[PDB]
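Query structure, 206 C-alpha cells:
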C-alpha cells in the first residue's frame, strides 16, 4: 500500500508531545553553530505520522532481539537527521546506504545533534539553494523514531564500526574529552521505524 502520511493537528497531544521533545532537547554545541546553524528554537511547521504496514519488518526484528536479549528489546524514541529522509519514509532505513562515521545508521536523543546532519556530515555545504548551513529560510526535515537497541555496546568512538559486537545489537558512542553527547547506532535498517516526520526551520535568535 506504501507509506501514508497522517497529519497531526497541533491541538492533538501527540503533536505537542513530539514538538516538546524536539524543542527541549536543543543543546549548544562546541562548533559555534557551524554544522547545524545558530538558533535557540525551531519553527515546527508540520508533523506527520508515518504509516507503513515497515512496521512488520520492524516488529519481526524486534522479536529476534528480544529473544537474544532476555526478552528485552530495549526500545528508545530517538531523532534522526540525514539528506535521505524522503527515501527513508518510503523504503525504510537501509544500512546499505550508510556512509567519525562508521557503517551504521545514527540517532540522537538531542534534536540539535540530528539537525547537524540534515545537510550531511558536518552540515555539508548547507541548504541546496543558498548553500548556507544556518539557513532560516529552507524547510528541514528530521525523524523521531522507534529504535530497537537491544543489548548496546558502550564505547568512546564509533568511526571504526561496521557491526555490533557479538551478543549486542547496537553501539552507543559516549562522551570523552571525543564526543559531546551520545550517539546511538544500529547496523540493521529494520531496528528502527520512522514514526514521525517533522518539517521545520531553525529560527534566528531574537
Ligand atoms: C533510496 C535511498 C537512497 C539513499 N539513502 C537511503 C536510506 N538511507 C539510510 O537509511 C541512511 C541515512 C543516513 C545514514 N547515515 C547516518 O545516520 C550517519 C551517516 C549516514 O550516512 C552521515 C549522515 C548522517 C550520519 C552522518 C545511514 C543510513 C534509506 C532508505 C533508502 C535510501
Ligand atoms: Zn536555504
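Result returned for the query:
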Amino acid at each position: 500500500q506504501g507509506t501514508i502520511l497522517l497529519d497531526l493537528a497541533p491541538e492533538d497531544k501527540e503533536y505537542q508531545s513530539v514538538e516538546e521533545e524536539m524543542q527541549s532537547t536543543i543543546r549548544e554545541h562546541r562548533d559555534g553553530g557551524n554544522a547545524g546553524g545558530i538558533f535557540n528554537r525551531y519553527n515546527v511547521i508540520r508533523i506527520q505520522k508515518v504509516v507503513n504496514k515497515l512496521r512488520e519488518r520492524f516488529c519481526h526484528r524486534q522479536k529476534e532481539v528480544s529473544e537474544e536479549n532476555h526478552n528485552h528489546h530495549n526500545e528508545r524514541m530517538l531523532f534522526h537527521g540525514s539528506p535521505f529522509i524522503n527515501a527513508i519514509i518510503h523504503k525504510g532505513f537501509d544500512e546499505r546506504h550508510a556512509y567519525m562515521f562508521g557503517a551504521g545508521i545514527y540517532f540522537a536523543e538531542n534534536s540539535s545533534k540530528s539537525n547537524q546532519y540534515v545537510y550531511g556530515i558536518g552540515g555539508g555545504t548547507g541548504c541546496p539553494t543558498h548553500k548556507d548551513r544556518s539557513c532560516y529560510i529552507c524547510h528541514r526535515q528530521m525523524l523521531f523514531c522507534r529504535v530497537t537497541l537491544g543489548k548496546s555496546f558502550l564505547q568512546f568512538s564509533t568511526m571504526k564500526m561496521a557491526h555490533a559486537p557479538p551478543g549486542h545489537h547496537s553501539v552507543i558512542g559516549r562522551p570523552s574529552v571525543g564526543l559531546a553527547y551520545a550517539e546511538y547506532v544500529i547496523y540493521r535498517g529494520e531496528q528502527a521505524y520512522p514514526e514521525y516526520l517533522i518539517t521545520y526551520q531553525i529560527m534566528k535568535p531574537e
